[PDB]
Amino acid sequence: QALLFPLCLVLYTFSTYIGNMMIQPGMLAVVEQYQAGIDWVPTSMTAYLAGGMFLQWLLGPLSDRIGRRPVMLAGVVWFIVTCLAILLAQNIEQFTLLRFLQGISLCFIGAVGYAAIQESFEEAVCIKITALMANVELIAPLLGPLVGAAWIHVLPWEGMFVLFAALAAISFFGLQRAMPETATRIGEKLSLKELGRDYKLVLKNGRFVAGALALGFVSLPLLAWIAQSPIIIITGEQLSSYEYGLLQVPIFGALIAGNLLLARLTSRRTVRSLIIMGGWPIMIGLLVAAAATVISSHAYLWMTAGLSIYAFGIGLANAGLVRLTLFASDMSKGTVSAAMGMLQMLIFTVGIEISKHAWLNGGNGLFNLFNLVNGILWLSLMVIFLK
């Protein structure tokens, strides 16, 4: 009678994702309007992502105790408020803090929204819902930059946050009528001390931590590209929004192509073999982008080629490493998931800032060299992690 639930959670998820991806290309208009330096462009995403790791560890056990409905709806509202509130920001510092506060809305998708999905639907229907969510996450970083660039060509950046709030508002009402209460520990006491002990315990698991760290390092080059390609292409290479948008296609296309191959190969390949398989394009790609731009600072097409090859590798290898990492720890999936979520966003957050300084100080060469060491760190962890 009511499938409005998973569909509205999907719409919310989509909106928090363009909440990131549509904004990055817009950030050039943003810093122009505040008369802030281009160094604040990538920090927009850093702050957004830092918000995404802020309440991770807490929302799951909390929504288990007080209800999935109140917590989930609260997150959607928080998203609406913080999106609107950024229109009143008076300087880039204030703009960035709000990016952070908006980012907290991310924590609600996995820890409480998705947990409600698992506690509602048949193990078969739940698979198709998760498939749709994965498609959304795969399409957002492709569509976002393109839509974002075409948006600021005709409309003010403030408009984008109105769009995000509107979409999430639609999504609020759909969840208000169709989301069931599935929390199993309603009324039970939540102990922050026991929660801390849970997390101290998961982190002592060496094999788990290596896999979690590896996921962060390996995805970092992709996130660093999202954060910085606007300043790399437009302000750096003196190119237009058209080239910026176009260079996105081979990169996230290859990501998609990588996940598609993974779909076809999975019945005749173990997770272990697909990771080793992905390792070749992951490494070759990063190597190519680094060598080329060391050789020639402005070889941005070689750079895009390298990153496409790398992105294909990620498509093939990551989901399998996610699975192994999840099952490398025997503790509650809520706890294990939030732990691996926080570990990798720690790497993204710090990594984008280091990346930004690499590019500001040494240009494309440094940008790509830093990406290469991240791949090497993944590779290093995989030699130990695989057995």
Q: Residues 135-174: x/- map of binding to Pr ion (CB under 5 A)?
A: ----------------------------------------
Q: CB of 49: closest distance to ligand CLM in angstroms? A: 6
Measured CA to CA, the distance from residue 101 to residue 122 in angstroms comes to 34
> From ligand CLM, Pr ion, none, which one binds at residue 299 (CB under 5 to 8 Å depending on kind)?
none
Q: CB of 71: closest distance to Pr ion in angstroms? A: 18
| Residue 155 CB neighbour total at 10 angstroms | 14
**Residues numbered 226-245 forming contacts with Pr ion, rule: CB under 5 A:** none
- By CB under 6 A, residue 106 contacts ligand CLM: yes
**Residues numbered 176-215 forming contacts with Pr ion, rule: CB under 5 A:** 194, 198
Kindly list the distances between the CA atom of residue 136 and the CA atoms of 256, 266, 353, in Å, as whole numbers in the listed order. Answer: 11, 21, 26
Measured CA to CA, the distance from residue 338 to residue 108 in angstroms comes to 11
Measured CA to CA, the distance from residue 235 to residue 257 in angstroms comes to 30
For 229, the token pair is: 């390609």
- By CB under 6 A, residue 344 contacts ligand CLM: yes
Closest by alpha carbon to 357, among 26, 98, 46?
A: 46
- By CB under 6 A, residue 79 contacts ligand CLM: no
Residue 127 CB-density burial (10 A; 0-12 exposed, 13-18 middle, 19+ buried): exposed
Nearer to ligand CLM by Cβ, of 322 and 331: the residue is: 322
Nearer to Pr ion by Cβ, of 177 and 185: the residue is: 185
Residue nearest to ligand CLM (CB): 219
Q: Residues 201-240: x/- map of binding to ligand CLM (CB under 6 A)?
A: ------------------x--xx-----------------
- By CB under 6 A, residue 308 contacts ligand CLM: no
Measured CA to CA, the distance from residue 121 to residue 223 in angstroms comes to 32
Nearer to Pr ion by Cβ, of 188 and 194: the residue is: 194
Q: What does the DSSP 8-state code read for residue 208?
A: H
- By CB under 6 A, residue 20 contacts ligand CLM: yes
For 235, the token pair is: 């302000």
Closest by alpha carbon to 207, among 332, 377, 330, 316?
A: 330
Q: CB of 215: closest distance to ligand CLM in angstroms? A: 7
| Residue 96 CB neighbour total at 10 angstroms | 21
Q: Which residues bind ligand CLM (CB under 6 A)?
A: 17, 20, 49, 106, 137, 219, 222-223, 314, 318, 344
